[PDB]
Amino acid sequence: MAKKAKLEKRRHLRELRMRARQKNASIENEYKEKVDENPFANLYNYGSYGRGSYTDPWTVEEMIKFYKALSMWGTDFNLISQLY
């Protein structure tokens, strides 16, 4: 049950990326999701709580806007970070 649910966890994290491409305190605590903990789900390894993440692989549509600003300026990371 935990192994099959693990693939669903990254499944929500794929659609977050492509969409980006395009007393009173307890009331909302009741409105939050209620879930049972199974000890296999939260399991941690060496790959946990660390720097870095999975970069989006680049596209050919990004290449033509990359190579053109690469050609105009020498090498300027600053303004091209705002381009993407």
């Binding site: 305190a25 307890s26 909302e28 605590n29």
Partner: protein, 50 residues
């Protein structure tokens, strides 16, 4: 009398009542730990099993 209802009646029947009933009655008197900082945080004791 002594066959079904022994001679260590006092220590058996008192402690065995403590295990079943009274242990639920303690956590229901100290449920819902709370903090002032982060007021939307809570932890609650729902049941007890030994």
């Amino acid at each position: 009398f002594l066959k079904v209802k022994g001679l260590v009646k006092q220590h058996l029947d008192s402690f065995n009542y403590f295990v079943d009933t009274d242990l639920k009655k303690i956590i229901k008197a100290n449920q819902l730990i709370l903090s002032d900082v982060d007021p939307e945080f809570y932890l609650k004791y729902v049941d007890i099993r030994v």
